[PDB]
């Protein structure tokens, strides 16, 4: 197990760690989070009690270094930093662990939720979407725009998701206009899978990462990307069977985890009704269709 210590907690804040969250009071004796499961990426996220503006947070993998959080009173946020002195880091963590000033990552043993949401997500791929090469962890917030949003403005602070545009020359072969517009299999299998992502695991990783940024930060461009990546598969007549089965599992766990009271802002009615009831794959997502119909029948 690994640990993200906190130098202090000078401002009252709701702290998220993966799908969990807890509140810390202003100047409370809080010194971080222990027992973080090794083997997965993680996200630690923040919403200030006195200014819910800007949710923000950090994606990290404890296998890549020793990370800690310290508040910066000038920029007014909790910042992730890397401690290069391993002995100092071990000593500080042990002291705080002995004084019981850390919360424990509260994983139920039966519970595979986080693995199910991050199965295909890798830090190396996160670090290409979020470009800040001097850090081993990646900052995301509520307001960051995507490369595609910026084409339709500070490029250094952008989410470099793969651009998907159904009415673009990339999506449509000259001479196959009707074919390629009504059946996106070319665009999915040749352009995106074979050409850009290389395999379906990388495509699913970006899809999962987009959903998580949408859910944890309310990042609008991330929600757009998530839906575009779903629609691209559902609108293709020819999809490898293993991909459809895996997509159903991915989407089921995303819908299961979504806060019920955020469904109105996190789910696009057009895309979901199209994917579940009109698309080529309308009968290939049995688990997702069942949870959607039982949890959010209003959207449909």
């Amino acid at each position: 197990m690994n640990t993200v210590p906190f130098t202090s907690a000078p401002i009252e804040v709701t702290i998220g760690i993966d799908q969990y969250s807890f509140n810390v009071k202003e100047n409370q004796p809080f010194h971080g989070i222990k027992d973080i499961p090794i083997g997965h990426v993680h996200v630690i996220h923040f919403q200030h009690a006195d200014n819910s503006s800007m949710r923000y947070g950090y994606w990290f993998d404890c296998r890549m270094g020793n990370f800690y959080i310290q508040y910066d009173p000038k920029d007014g946020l909790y910042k992730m930093m890397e401690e290069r002195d391993g002995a100092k880091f071990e000593n500080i963590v042990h002291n705080f662990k002995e004084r019981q000033m850390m919360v424990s990552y509260p994983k139920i043993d039966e519970d595979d939720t986080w693995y199910n949401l991050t199965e295909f997500v890798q830090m190396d791929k996160i670090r290409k979407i979020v470009r800040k090469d001097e850090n081993q962890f990646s900052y995301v917030d509520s307001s960051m725009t995507t490369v595609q949003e910026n084409e339709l403005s500070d490029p250094a602070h952008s989410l470099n998701y793969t651009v998907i545009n159904f009415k673009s020359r990339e999506a449509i072969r000259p001479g196959h206009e009707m074919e390629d517009f009504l059946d996106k299999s070319y665009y999915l299998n040749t352009v995106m899978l074979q050409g850009i992502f290389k395999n379906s695991s990388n495509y699913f990783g970006e899809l999962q990462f987009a959903f998580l940024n949408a859910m944890f930060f309310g990042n609008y461009g991330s929600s757009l990307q998530w839906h575009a990546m779903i629609e691209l598969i559902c609108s293709s007549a020819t999809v490898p069977k293993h991909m459809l089965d895996k997509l159903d599992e991915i989407l089921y766990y995303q819908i299961k985890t979504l806060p019920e009271q955020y469904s109105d802002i996190l789910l696009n009615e057009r895309v979901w009704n199209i994917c579940l009831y009109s698309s080529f794959q309308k009968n290939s997502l049995h688990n997702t269709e069942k949870i959607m119909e039982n949890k959010y029948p209003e959207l449909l």
Binding site: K167, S168, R169, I172, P174, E177, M178, F181
Partner: protein
């Protein structure tokens, strides 16, 4: 965006534009079969592509052979229309290519947009005008060329004859739409109005009769009376 009555004079400015109407592309007769089912039989159709400023009409004749062995013909017809309009644009010299293409039916937007991706500076727009271009096949010389075609063919016409020698393109378009609306509402009576007087005849190189200015006023009034007469017949007014 969409084209309506607020920006109606835009049709007659100096930016080249084309209306595209696909109503008459896929045409069928419906009949019973020997077994008592129902079958369709396609007949020749046409794409109606019109420059409202100059009157130039690019009439692409759609021969029934294009439908042979194809499925989902109503959908295919929109994509075939878009393919042919795209081909027309590419065939025109750059200085003759339109800056805007206005489709009469919103279902033509995506097919045309996709076929014209190579022309990002040509705007593809709908219209809120209800334009009676479906009645093009009530114009005898247009219907004759479509029905006689034995293969795909493009035929060029000036749908205004020589009217632009005497009137503006705004007035000419208004005259055309009134004539087409009348032919759409009551074709027999419209042709009667247009042809009753034998001393006034259509020139070999024209589509409509050779009316003087005063006679066009009379004809236009008779067409408006026809439209109103039919409105009253329809709604019992």
């Amino acid at each position: 965006g969409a084209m309506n009555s607020s920006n109606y004079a835009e049709l007659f400015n100096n930016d080249i534009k084309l209306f595209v109407d696909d109503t008459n592309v896929y045409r069928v007769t419906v009949h019973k079969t020997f077994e008592g089912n129902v079958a369709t039989k396609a007949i020749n159709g046409c794409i109606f592509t019109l420059n409202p400023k100059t009157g130039h009409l690019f009439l692409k004749i759609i021969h029934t052979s294009v439908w042979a062995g194809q499925k989902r013909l109503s959908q295919l017809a929109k994509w075939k229309t878009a393919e042919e309009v795209s081909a027309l644009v590419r065939s025109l010299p750059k200085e003759e290519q339109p800056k805007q293409i206005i489709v009469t039916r919103k279902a033509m937007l995506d097919p045309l947009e996709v076929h014209m991706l190579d022309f990002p500076n040509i705007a593809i727009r709908p219209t809120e005008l209800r334009l009676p271009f479906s009645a093009a096949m009530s114009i005898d010389k247009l219907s004759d060329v479509v029905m006689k075609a034995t293969e795909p063919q493009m035929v060029l016409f000036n749908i205004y004859d020589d009217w632009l020698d005497r009137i503006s393109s705004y007035t000419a378009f208004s005259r055309l739409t009134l004539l087409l609306r009348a032919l759409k509402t009551n074709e027999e009576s419209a042709k009667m109005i247009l042809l009753s007087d034998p001393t006034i005849t259509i020139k070999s190189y024209h589509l409509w009769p050779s009316f003087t200015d005063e006679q066009w006023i009379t004809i236009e009034s008779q067409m408006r009376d026809l439209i109103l007469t039919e409105y009253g017949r329809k709604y019992n007014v």
